[PDB]
Amino acid sequence: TTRNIEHAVIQVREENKFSLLKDVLMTENPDSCIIFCRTKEHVNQLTDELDDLGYPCDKIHGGMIQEDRFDVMNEFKRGEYRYLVATDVAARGIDIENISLVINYDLPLEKESYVHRTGRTGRAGNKGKAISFVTAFEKRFLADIEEYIGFEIQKIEA
């Protein structure tokens, strides 16, 4: 069955990622979105910053006990919030019917992860999108991903 995922990369400096995320969310205005980070520390910081600005969100990472990760994912499945901030642990066993937008706030440093993160996007007729933030120091990691998925990802601005 045909998967429908538009992929895009945005080159951005680390210190300007949060400002970029706010613009992307404003422009994409997704009904459901998962924002992946590399470490639980990044997840915690990003959730605090989103919280302080009034964004309805929640988080999932390896420092949380199993029942909390489960309950947080159920609230997401019920649509109680639009943005889930998470590490790759949220992608394992992920079974939520659909996630419209995947944002790799931190580009995956292991190529298989890029595909794993888009696991519930663009399926069964849903139109999906994956936007990755890439710094000047991650060009080789991006090239690894592109050779792995078999195609180059379009770089876009703003």
Cβ(72)–Cβ(122) below 8 Å: no
**Alpha carbon of 99 to those of 41, 74, 123, 141: distances in Å?**
24, 13, 9, 24
Rg (CA), the chain: 15
CA separation for the pair 47, 152 (Å, rounded): 31
Q: Regarding the domain with residue range 1-158, which homologous superfamily does it belong to in the CATH classification?
A: P-loop containing nucleotide triphosphate hydrolases (3.40.50.300)
Cβ(24)–Cβ(145) below 8 Å: no
Cβ(25)–Cβ(18) below 8 Å: no
Strands 33-36, 83-86: pairing kind: parallel
**78-99 exposure pattern, b = at least 16 Cβ within 10 A, e = fewer:** eeeebbbbbbbbbbeebebeeb
Contacts of 81 (CB under 8 A, 6+ apart): 56, 57, 58, 75
CA separation for the pair 152, 11 (Å, rounded): 14
CA separation for the pair 134, 94 (Å, rounded): 24
What is the DSSP annotation of 115-127? HHHTTTSS-TT--
Residue ranges per structural domain of the chain? 1-158
For residues 39, 15, 110, 61, the Cα torsion angle rounded to the nearest 10 degrees is: 20
| Resolution for the entry shown, Å | 2.0
The arrangement of strands across the sheet holding 5-11 comes to 57-60, 83-86, 33-36, 101-104, 128-134, 5-11, 154-155
Secondary structure element (H or E) that encloses residue 20, with its range: helix 17-28
**Alpha carbon of 65 to those of 41, 60, 71, 124: distances in Å?**
16, 10, 10, 32
